[PDB]
Symmetry: D6
Subunit: 125 residues, 12 copies
């Protein structure tokens, strides 16, 4: 039964909104202080904390599409969502371009709130 699946989609959407608005404070509230991240911008390295994503919230016409979302409920305090993210944007040439990414978010419940404890993206920035 999808009791909390919508509950996961809610905080996921709030995450997307915090990224879109460039609001780093809301992103800090939704992430564990010791959050780890694999991503193409990490160049294959395991980077910990929000110190790495900060550089993007302080320096950043697009359209985002989420394809094939899968949610794994792991009890009453752990969840994990994986999906394909397709981003349509305009390059410096003003030409339409599209980029695909495969994203995995690991959510943990602490004190009645979902927080990202690990993030894994591949393979487009």
């Amino acid at each position: 039964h999808m009791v909390r699946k919508q509950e996961i989609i809610k905080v996921t959407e709030q995450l997307i909104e915090a990224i879109s608005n460039g609001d780093f404070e809301s992103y800090t509230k939704m992430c564990d202080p010791g959050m780890t991240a694999f991503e193409p911008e990490a160049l294959g390295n395991l980077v910990e904390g929000l110190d790495f994503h900060r550089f993007y919230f302080e320096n950043l016409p697009v359209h985002t599409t989420i394809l094939n979302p899968h949610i794994h409920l792991m009890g009453d305090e752990s969840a994990c969502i994986a999906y394909i993210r397709i981003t349509q944007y305009l390059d410096a040439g003003g030409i339409p371009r599209t980029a695909q990414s495969e994203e995995t978010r690991v959510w943990h419940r602490r004190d009645g709130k979902w927080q990202i404890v690990h993030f894994h993206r591949s393979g487009a920035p």
Copy 2:
């Protein structure tokens, strides 16, 4: 620290099950509805183990795990992320090395840790 070497233990049994080509144990370690992102999937999300079966039918290699980080989420779920370096030989026999970024998501159901979803980057 204590329940971290259990995640490490089932992870080592997982990697060893992959290196020995033991599909029988791998199936036991994976949930039937396990999802996976990996280069072999060509950007698509593959569910189950029917996709991973083909890679068990198919000499000396050496695996080195670097910077393992473990996130504990309660008492029935965890997630381990690490860098996997692999030294091997290519037909002509020259030593080669490949890097991978792996994330395993473990969950305890019926008193047994199992992979529910895993994410790989690189090779």
Copy 3:
């Protein structure tokens, strides 16, 4: 032969809507649950018209000419048809040089309320 001329008409109207960037006429000729395989989708299957709106707004006054080569129409009753054709596009790049691009296209038409609509389409070749 008369039944295929209708499909030719609605197809040419579709390509005219894409060429002129008329997204409203495009939405009228497309089913709300339309699926599409296209090079801009990066091998993924996308559903709905929300994915093409981005190309209607941003990408679309440079002269462009479109040519339809060797259409083939399969009639499947009085309410369903399929058309496959080669689409050539002569355009100008940033340097003003004349250029040309080929694209293989498949359109799956379904007559609903006496009005043909695309339920699925498949484009290949260069975008």
Copy 4:
């Protein structure tokens, strides 16, 4: 292979099709295809091929595991349907290494005399 009542019929005849191709059975493949079947595929090099004469070369001249991802089905009456899906193929090259390939496929089925047959199909990606 790997992956509400009528959709499973299209899925069934489609799986029978893919297995008829994997085994090299041109007989059952010919029975499941219309004689005027049209095709877009990388083997046709951007051209539109008609009939089954182009596909015979492969059954005659040509360890594989096929996987189907996210099948979508469009029903257009009780005699016309259209299925689109992702086709992953795990195989071995002459070098012996396992390779994987992706191809987006679109099949257009039409019921004629109580039997579904392919009238047109469109594949992109893996040649």
Copy 5:
């Protein structure tokens, strides 16, 4: 442009030179008269496809050719006469031009024209171009 019974051969050379001059001047009006309405065409601008009509070349007459210094050179022309009303000429076209801020450039193409006299007037029924 530079070029290079026999009377008839020369006639074909005449209508061909007028064709090249019409293309160079961007005069689609004269280009239409020398071409059959159902003219067949193979050219690299068609990307391996067969093009019928004059709608396809109109895009190049309108845009590009309507104009920096350009010199054409015809090399090794061969003419096949096939009766009073049919002929075929094949030759090598070399074009010297300038790109952006020249930098003088040169390009080669191999061209075949199939001429047919209809109602006392030579018209192209089909032509073939390579490497352009």
Copy 6:
């Protein structure tokens, strides 16, 4: 090989199919009869040059074609009739073959043949090929 007044059009189709079959079988004898001794040719094997005669294609009849499974497919044929004694056909040739240890391969070319009836027999006076 698969292909695909009107009687005359079909006649051209006949001699053309016989040409393709003669090339496929490596039968230079029959290929010589259907070609004019002074046949003109543009083809990628000539590297942008114009080739006259049948000496040039003989190297391909002797060496290569004298033989793994190969299937030809003719797409979008167009025929221009230019009087009783002249005709021209243009089409797309697609060849399915095998390289070394196939690995089935496919290749496209755009071909133009210029036929001329001399003494009650169609002969090629010139032909043009692209992308092969």
Copy 7:
């Protein structure tokens, strides 16, 4: 201009204090590089310091004039934001007056255009204390 680290695995051990000293002078070095401060960098470097780096094209440069070019031209001009991350620092202590740190340096920066780019460089810094102050006698960089 700032920098982060990953010191949880390194600090655990016998000699926390000296490890912290070497990380301190290392972060002061990287801070002097990020700000183009050639004065502080000169104070933290031995006069006879040797260097291996991609800018040397496989050669062993000695002194500070080779790096002075980059301090004067490239790093002095930087007004764009640059963020440095020190991943997985390992410290080898070799007596009271010598140490050696190795780490992965990840640089987040803005290119010519306004596009964020990331660069990785494996760095080895060899520290030697003379006159009661740690100084670099040799360093080795890989990657660009």
Copy 8:
């Protein structure tokens, strides 16, 4: 398997003896690598030795098992001739129990075919004396 050097510019200075010691143990290290002698290489290396090299793909490997693969498979099999040259060695002495050598390593070898090939690698070796014996605590290689 042999190796040459260029020690005329390095030996001139105050501490000839210790410089010669470090060059000696360095040439013994390279000699153990050229012969695939994992025993001698193990004796000359600290157990907690760290490493940066192109084989590590920008990662910091620790221990000796990563190099053991190359000793067992690649370097044990070598029956072909290999000649190593140590160009421009620079030595930094950091107390009685620590030293650091940097040099250009040029390898003349025979490839798969019988064609002579040359490889360059910039090498930094960090030596620390424990139990009266010099050992590598860290090294850094560039180039292939």
Copy 9:
């Protein structure tokens, strides 16, 4: 420019030729060339060009320092000669950087009515 009695005549008319090309003087260049002069050069794209009509495009449409290296001269009577040499050209691109180019040149001179003229020339390398 830069670099036993008759050879200096060929060298003299050759230097006058190269300077006539560098200044863009098509008049003196035409006087020094035979009307039926043939040419191999990279600008001809592997073809053999006849006359001076092909070279006019350059005098009309087109900081250079030319150097001649190792000139060899073959005398074949008192009315025919052939000189071969290396031609280095130091110039500046639109980027402003000094560039250097090499071209091997062969000139075939023939004395007609008491004046040497080029009947044929062959250049390789720099286009």
Copy 10:
């Protein structure tokens, strides 16, 4: 026209000697002090026949066909002539695949003791 046929004869004999690898006949038709620009010389001018002997011995029983396209002959008296032509070579590679190569060639003939000999030649294009 008769005077040019002799040059055609000696030129065809030269190409026959190169094709059959007959180095002695090649030395008879070449002046001892012959100069050559050729792609095998890497932009350098080589003198004598010692440089071509290497190609006669080592490189030269695979079927090869040579075609001479558009020859042009300049007569410069009764003892000196020049011929320029395009040379096509159809051959087989290591894989047995038919291949073709173009080459622009210039031959400078000089009649000595009633026998034409090459004093200089210039080849370009692929070797």
Copy 11:
């Protein structure tokens, strides 16, 4: 060691004469029949200074000389070989570095060192 810094001195006056674009001094430092191998010569041997003139007509750069080796041959001839690294800026202004392998051949005629031939590799 003493007559090595004279070769170094005339070499430094040479390099400085090149950096300042002073053809006048360069001509004095070179024999009129000086031969040269260099990438700008495209593998050919250029004699004299007419070829080097063009490179004097044509902002901050930094030159570093590495591993200079001097061979003394008597009392009127010497030869110095060295590696020349050059840091510069490319139009867009990114710092760049180039390596060169240079060999200068000095000879004392009329009481003055002069280059008779020089050989360069790389940039």
Copy 12:
């Protein structure tokens, strides 16, 4: 006057013969113990002594051509020769190949014999 030019050509030819025969002893006699060499096999590094060339004398159908030789006589004890060396050879494919090099030899007279004190080659092995 070319008094010693032929005298330089003699020892140059003897050098070429020592290389062709693989005789490393004769090459040692004709080279100064502290000979320096720039060459493509040195990868831009200045290598000293005959220790580097040894590897080639102990591990090695061709034809060599010398073009445009220039000799610089620098007194009665120093000379310097520069020339272009073109080598025709057969590759592993059995295909004729050709390679160009630009060579500079610096000869010094000591005890009545010419010896190579410096060598510079570019840019083919």
